[PDB]
Amino acid sequence: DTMKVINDPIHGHIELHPLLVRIIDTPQFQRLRYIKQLGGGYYVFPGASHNRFEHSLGVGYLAGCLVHALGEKQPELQISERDVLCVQIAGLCRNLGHGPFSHMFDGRFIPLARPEVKWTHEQGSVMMFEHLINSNGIKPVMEQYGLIPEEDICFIKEQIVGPLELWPYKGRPENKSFLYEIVSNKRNGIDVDKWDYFARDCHHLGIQNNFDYKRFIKFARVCEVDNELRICARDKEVGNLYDMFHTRNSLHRRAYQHKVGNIIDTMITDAFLKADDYIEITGAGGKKYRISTAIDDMEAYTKLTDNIFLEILYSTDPKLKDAREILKQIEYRNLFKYVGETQPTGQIKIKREDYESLPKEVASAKPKVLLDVKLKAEDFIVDVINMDYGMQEKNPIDHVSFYCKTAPNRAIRITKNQVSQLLPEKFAEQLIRVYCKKVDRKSLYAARQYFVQWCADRNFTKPQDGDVIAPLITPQKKEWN
Amino acid sequence: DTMKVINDPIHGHIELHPLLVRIIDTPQFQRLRYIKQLGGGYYVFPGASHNRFEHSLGVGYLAGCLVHALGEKQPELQISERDVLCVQIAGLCRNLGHGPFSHMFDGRFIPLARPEVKWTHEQGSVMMFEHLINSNGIKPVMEQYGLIPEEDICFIKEQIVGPLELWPYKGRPENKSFLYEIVSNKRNGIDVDKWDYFARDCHHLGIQNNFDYKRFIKFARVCEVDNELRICARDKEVGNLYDMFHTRNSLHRRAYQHKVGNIIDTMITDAFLKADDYIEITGAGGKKYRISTAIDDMEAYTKLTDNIFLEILYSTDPKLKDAREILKQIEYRNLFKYVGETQPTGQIKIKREDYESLPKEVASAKPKVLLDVKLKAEDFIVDVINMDYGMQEKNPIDHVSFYCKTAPNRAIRITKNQVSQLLPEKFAEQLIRVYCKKVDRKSLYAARQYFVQWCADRNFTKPQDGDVIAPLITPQKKEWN
Amino acid sequence: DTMKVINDPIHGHIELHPLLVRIIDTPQFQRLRYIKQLGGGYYVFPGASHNRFEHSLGVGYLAGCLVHALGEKQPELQISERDVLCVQIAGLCRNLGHGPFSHMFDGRFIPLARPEVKWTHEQGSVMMFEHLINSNGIKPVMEQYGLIPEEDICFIKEQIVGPLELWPYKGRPENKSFLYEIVSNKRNGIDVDKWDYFARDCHHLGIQNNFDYKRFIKFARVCEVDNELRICARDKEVGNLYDMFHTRNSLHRRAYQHKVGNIIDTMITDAFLKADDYIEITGAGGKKYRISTAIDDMEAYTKLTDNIFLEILYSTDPKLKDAREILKQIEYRNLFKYVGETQPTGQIKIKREDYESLPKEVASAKPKVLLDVKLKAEDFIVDVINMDYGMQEKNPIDHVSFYCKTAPNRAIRITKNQVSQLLPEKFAEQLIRVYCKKVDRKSLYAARQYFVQWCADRNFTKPQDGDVIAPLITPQKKEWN
Amino acid sequence: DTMKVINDPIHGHIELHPLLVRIIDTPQFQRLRYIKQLGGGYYVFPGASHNRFEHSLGVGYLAGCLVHALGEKQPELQISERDVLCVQIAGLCRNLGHGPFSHMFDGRFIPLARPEVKWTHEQGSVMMFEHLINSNGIKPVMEQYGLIPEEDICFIKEQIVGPLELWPYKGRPENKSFLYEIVSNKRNGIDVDKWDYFARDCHHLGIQNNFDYKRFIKFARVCEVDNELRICARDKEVGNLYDMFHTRNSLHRRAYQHKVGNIIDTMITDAFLKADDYIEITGAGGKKYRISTAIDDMEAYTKLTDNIFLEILYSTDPKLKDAREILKQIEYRNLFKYVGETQPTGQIKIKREDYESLPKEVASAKPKVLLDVKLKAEDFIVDVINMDYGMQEKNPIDHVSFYCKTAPNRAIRITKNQVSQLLPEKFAEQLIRVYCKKVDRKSLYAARQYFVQWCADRNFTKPQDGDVIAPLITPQKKEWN
Numbered sequence A, B, C, D: 001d002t003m004k005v006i007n008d009p010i011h012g013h014i015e016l017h018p019l020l021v022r023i024i025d026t027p028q029f030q031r032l033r034y035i036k037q038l039g040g041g042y043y044v045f046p047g048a049s050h051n052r053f054e055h056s057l058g059v060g061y062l063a064g065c066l067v068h069a070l071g072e073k074q075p076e077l078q079i080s081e082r083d084v085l086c087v088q089i090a091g092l093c094r095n096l097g098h099g100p101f102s103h104m105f106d107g108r109f110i111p112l113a114r115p116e117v118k119w120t121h122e123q124g125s126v127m128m129f130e131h132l133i134n135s136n137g138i139k140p141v142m143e144q145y146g147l148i149p150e151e152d153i154c155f156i157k158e159q160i161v162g163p164l165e166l167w168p169y170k171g172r173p174e175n176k177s178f179l180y181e182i183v184s185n186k187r188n189g190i191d192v193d194k195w196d197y198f199a200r201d202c203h204h205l206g207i208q209n210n211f212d213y214k215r216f217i218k219f220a221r222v223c224e225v226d227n228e229l230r231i232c233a234r235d236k237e238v239g240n241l242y243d244m245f246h247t248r249n250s251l252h253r254r255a256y257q258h259k260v261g262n263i264i265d266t267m268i269t270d271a272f273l274k275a276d277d278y279i280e281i282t283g284a285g286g287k288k289y290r291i292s293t294a295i296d297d298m299e300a301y302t303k304l305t306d307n308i309f310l311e312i313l314y315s316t317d318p319k320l321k322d323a324r325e326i327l328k329q330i331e332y333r334n335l336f337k338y339v340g341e342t343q344p345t346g347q348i349k350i351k352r353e354d355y356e357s358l359p360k361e362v363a364s365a366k367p368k369v370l371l372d373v374k375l376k377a378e379d380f381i382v383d384v385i386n387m388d389y390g391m392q393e394k395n396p397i398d399h400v401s402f403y404c405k406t407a408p409n410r411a412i413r414i415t416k417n418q419v420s421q422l423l424p425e426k427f428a429e430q431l432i433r434v435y436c437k438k439v440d441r442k443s444l445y446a447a448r449q450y451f452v453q454w455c456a457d458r459n460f461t462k463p464q465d466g467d468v469i470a471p472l473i474t475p476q477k478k479e480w481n
């Protein structure tokens, strides 16, 4: 019937149009209440209990703010109430494809369980969306509020996942290209999804967010750029945009890639791999799926949430004993032990195809110290983390259009040297973390020696504590002294 | 083993002594990660995703702050490091006995499932604590850090639940009476547990907390009162104490007793009642328990969390169909419908023994109006809520001892009229909410006519929207205009 | 000329229309940068350095928010861009008449310096506004943006001060009556001025505000009430409105009437009285005024700010020696000493005409304790403070119109008993503070005996520390024992 | 005399020892209430009304936190209550030397008025401190609380200004070296002064601070480094330390060097230069000083505050007409106009001795565009701003000592490549801003052409809006295209 108000600690009072309420009040959407935003991060940062549900509300709210702000200041863009609703829906729905513990599922579990498939949460969001619509009779409701389902469903999916295949989009024409830059911005990654998570994650983690999305919204305008209408920021704000990506990188370094968070995600992934043959999830027509195959049936995937963790933990079946035991070690805080971190030097870049060979390389190192235990490849975990500004080696600010106060309809470019010499020289790097599955004192001492020796042999950077954890190894390396 | 630092969004960096870490890193404590602080409140306030776990860390931290502050200002009290740890442990552990959805479990479910038993979360905390200690070899660890288990375990339990029965306590002597006022203050309810939840619940709900616990700590002292050493507040702070209880009452009104939060707790309770025969929880020695009997075995209770909700929702067994269908209605937001609220007038006080008769009474009202449908007792839910300042009809500030700047060791009393005439004249009241299980438009119209007629017949207060929802009924009542 | 953005810590990014910018960029408006919001409160709460200038920006902003919100939800009201600008201007300009140290000037100094005149900051705001307009060529600028100066200048003044004398207003007709409720709400005091100062004063004082003005704005509507269009709140929000006035009262008790803040305001007022014959302020046509007569000439008043305080403090003229010495005692923190506080009982209400007799009464009390020193009337200060809900004895919520969800265009009333029995039974009271100008130990002891005896003789409430500060006096009073 | 509590919106309840209260309650300290922390920043960011007084309380509080934290963790350091108080005093007093509008006084005015003198606010703080102590009888009070004035006064001054002339300090010996790193850290700039102004300035400006000083305090330890006991940070925190300096730089870029804030500081400085021959400030024995010579007499300098601004503005003396007129233009917002910003390229570094030649260079540029007006050197202002990490070209993190969890007493170093490749390559740069004193449309157009042509001639970076403001000039430069 009518609009609803929701109170959110980040944004305050969010108004929801009744079509949005109908999308929200479904099993496919409400499911997001049972998926933690930060996965294993809650086990390090106890405030991070938030789930994808409330993040999705915030993304939909902000998407609506930005589109409304553009419309109000530039009526000549002809943004319709239909446009506004479609953008809010895409915003609400771009997290629907997340799986248990969020990035651990698409980032660790599925790549190990189903190495042959190419799955992303984005693709999952489109499939869940289609399933949500079809299972809940949403198309008639959309027509009731003036949407045109064929066009608008296409538009919504395109906002989430990009072109479903010269202007490549079918949901809207080039004169509305700027609409595609709101929810998931494939050109430079500046979108309302980051703005909600910066604010929400900081609130919960107890870390402070430096980025002012409202200021940015106020200074945003649409300008013509190479025969597209694109969103442009005020020239002055270029520093704040660099700062936005800097904040993204700090949040990754301190929280999202926390070394213990990551190892908890890894352990949970391992328990899931060991339980995968025994857990059954009933999908369409009563067919049974596994944790690794629920992504093939949306009805099964609907029922795949963080509950899988507790189902395993609370199980009594002897078949689940191995999985259950890994989870029990998490509760007792008997975790795989962090050994250290290093980075490649020079132009060395570690390729994905080499990842599996790394633990073997570490166990093959020949440190000169007397060791009571010997460790094997299987005792080591090597995590390779690609840290960047969202576009691999590229500077995303080279893909942003700006305008000046004296000519607000004229788009310009601003280069790095026009801003500051104190900015980063590079935009991507790799971090390598090593952990040991043997947690006793002697094994850990040994693991350290192998680790630092491997760093030396590969010409990686000297670990920060290298001289303390491996004082007999670090003197060999001239470049470190 | 050394101290750990945890970052909490409410309190910042909390330091945890290694004994505390050992208590925390157990299944019995980690269980609290899977129990929402506010139960069905998350279904109204989407920021309220927090669980009892992080609340318990905060209660333990604040307990430590208060005891440390007292010791530092008054060395003559002889507060030992042992005392400090025992108070931190009680603080950490006073939420261990909570069940699924927190107050819904002890407040709605158990009273209906096991009407013959007298269960409280406090009692449950003592039992889970004992089980935690015993199952994890904590006593030797306590001795390692200078605790004396026999005395100190007793002291901890007493802080949580009160005397395990003229000085009634055995864990500490009258010399240390003030220590019993920190974690769970039976005398007037001013304790660190409230202070954490005020700040934490407000952070998550998106409502602002007006109470300054750090100011109160700074102004607190121990003074002799009737041959006990008790905590006294500075005279000046009496207004801020009344404001504390006022804030508690606002939080209940706006959030904890939100009409839709309460109906969701009621629907979930109903699903639990319908599933209770079929859900099995394995406890000690492989014995099986139900949701309603897990409270009799701590090993089973350890595994009784919010996960029960999803286990039901995801079930395929036809035996669980009824329970599962209620939960499905929650997801679709097809909830029982709020009809209205009223209060008794005069000295009328509704007794617990009469609660069951109320839906009958409503259905027996004879509104003088044309009705398409007739409703029966079973179509109505009547919720009676007792709102007070924590001590029934009493003013808790009558039970607080104060001191003056001119004589800091002399305790005094301050009465209501010494403070302000703008304070409440009563400290307890009752609210009556009525809901209808028939949700269609005609049933709801009818429910409104019965409801308002019943209010008129009983001489209850006029519902705020009475003239709008029942314009043909409200004219009959002279007292209402 | 285009819009400007200002960043405010309370409201974020505030957009200012160019007409508003022109009003702001005048000596009459910028003057507010040199008048502390809380006067002598900065000398107790060191974060309270804020001035009337930034408060005025915030009031203008919120005035705009509320009027825009109403227009967007109810287009049928025909709120024009002209209406919006007039309301923003009134909001911006309702503080223009404040004098040095804000309420100290109109509340203490002018009543003692010019007892024959009836001066308010509201009257001063109208005069300064007229002077601002005329001195800066604003009328042509107003016309340029579609305002009609004769009607609209009237309207703005009426919003600030009320009718400049059946519909009593000339700036707008009855169908726009709701516009008069925004900036300065004479009917019940619920206006945007309070909302900005609650948030701003809390931010600076270091106290937390619990009123959510944004929620209130979202729930506000215009409805017909007795043939006027008035602003109505949603029924549900009635609790929050009581809480609003409760917050106002707490802020007055903790901050705005802090006993030391008030004594500093008194000492400053005293210095101003002693300097008044000697300070010259040049006004229109070179005429000279005094501090007490600058209110008669807006050109002189433009130059009358907190700077008077420093002019006196830094003076070398022997004529200002007495004034300067009082200010020097403030810097050394040699302040008059607080003796205690009490309240009248029963029907007793202390009239303004009796205020001067009260120190005489205190010095006339006859304690019957042995005293080293005797004190005279001139050694005592007695401060009488009227605390209420903004309408003397009346409940302002009786003057608020509400609507219900089922009939949003139908206004209703809600009485106290329809809300809660835990609300105040009275809405006004008086506090009496007593201070001694003799600050030595023996004088202060004596002052305490006189004070408490005077309380006993007048049947005032027992001071909270009475038994400690005057143990030989309090036993005499049966009613206190 | 007992402790006082002050409530601060940044830190909460700060306890002040009575010796500190005595230092605070003097004309020399209370003077800081009348000096804005951010000077002309209040004229851009209206929330920035805060003064140096409340900043100084915060620096003293944090200095006490850090020293107390070190003592509690490491009793073997033998930090005494005497050490604690001396560090709190130095913290309280390190802002005493600030002049009107803070950095504008020492940063713009004194360098132009007294080019021969080398004045810093640091030197001024030492002088004011000595004068504060002597004028107010503080030495006996210090002895009363166990301080030893000769040693401890030396120690305090050394903390503020560095060695008053191998261990160069006399106030404390090398085993207490770490105490010198708290208030003003000459080695790397990581001190409690930054930490307070980050949090306080952000709170007031409406920008969010992302540095967590409390976390840093908790991780700090004293370790031996080259036969000194120095403060060491945990290795892990190195990222956060880089982020701290990054935050400092953002605050300078967005706020402290705001182009309009700076121009206001310049205009005020200009008014002060024009008033300097006519304003009189009475110092010791009735002698008169000027604004530029008050720094030579502490009794005069005590009375030199932001009041000087209003004294000029409110003056009637025809000798002050020129000064008064500049201030009046500030009120009307007729400010000098910003033309643009650029930076040097390559190894070009602009020296202080060249600053005065720059406007001449700009006016000598030869654009070869048709110009209606010609501009002269005196029409241009050129502001050169040095932005760095506090140590000119150096990386301050190269001057930080760290420790590892496995060996907490063993200090180590961490290099930039051990941390991240996404860090800055350089640590100092210069910004050049140009403004025009002729504010009309034709002058401003011309100014732009000269500016951009000058950039091209000097091989400076292309202004961001260069192509829009000077489309005929920017094509000439190949390097820009």
Ligand SMILES: Nc1nc2c(ncn2[C@H]2C[C@H](O)[C@@H](COP(=O)(O)OP(=O)(O)OP(=O)(O)O)O2)c(=O)[nH]1
Pocket (backbone or CB within 6 Å): A005, A006, A007, A008, B044, B045, B046, B206, B207, B254, B255, B260, C212, C215, C236, C240, C405
């Ligand atoms: N800040 C704040 N939030 C509130 C308060 N009361 C409820 N909420 C939150 C919970 C929800 O997220 C949102 C809306 O709840 P309401 O109680 O207004 O809506 P509800 O649908 O129960 O009422 P309605 O259908 O309009 O009668 O506001 C309040 O007093 N303050």
Ligand SMILES: Nc1nc2c(ncn2[C@H]2C[C@H](O)[C@@H](COP(=O)(O)OP(=O)(O)OP(=O)(O)O)O2)c(=O)[nH]1
Pocket (backbone or CB within 6 Å): A044, A045, A046, A206, A207, A254, A255, A260, B005, B006, B007, B008, D212, D215, D236, D240, D405
């Ligand atoms: N505020 C804040 N909290 C952090 C940051 N890094 C981690 N935390 C949180 C996560 C935890 O709740 C707590 C301690 O985490 P740490 O990373 O310091 O401890 P962890 O045990 O991983 O390191 P350690 O064993 O000392 O090497 O602080 C940070 O950069 N800022």
Ligand SMILES: Nc1nc2c(ncn2[C@H]2C[C@H](O)[C@@H](COP(=O)(O)OP(=O)(O)OP(=O)(O)O)O2)c(=O)[nH]1
Pocket (backbone or CB within 6 Å): A212, A215, A236, A240, A405, C005, C006, C007, C008, D044, D045, D046, D206, D207, D254, D255, D260
């Ligand atoms: N939150 C935030 N506020 C800022 C920042 N930069 C400036 N402000 C504040 C200062 C003012 O209150 C307001 C507008 O400042 P701007 O620098 O955008 O306006 P200005 O008139 O100087 O620039 P313009 O005339 O548009 O070139 O925003 C920023 O980076 N973050």
Ligand SMILES: Nc1nc2c(ncn2[C@H]2C[C@H](O)[C@@H](COP(=O)(O)OP(=O)(O)OP(=O)(O)O)O2)c(=O)[nH]1
Pocket (backbone or CB within 6 Å): B212, B215, B240, B405, C044, C045, C046, C206, C207, C254, C255, C260, D005, D006, D007, D008
């Ligand atoms: N947060 C908070 N701050 C307060 C309150 N009352 C006063 N303050 C602030 C003002 C000052 O910065 C500081 C100390 O104020 P007090 O009223 O406790 O000190 P005062 O010296 O007036 O009392 P005393 O001499 O001890 O009777 O706390 C309050 O209720 N809450």
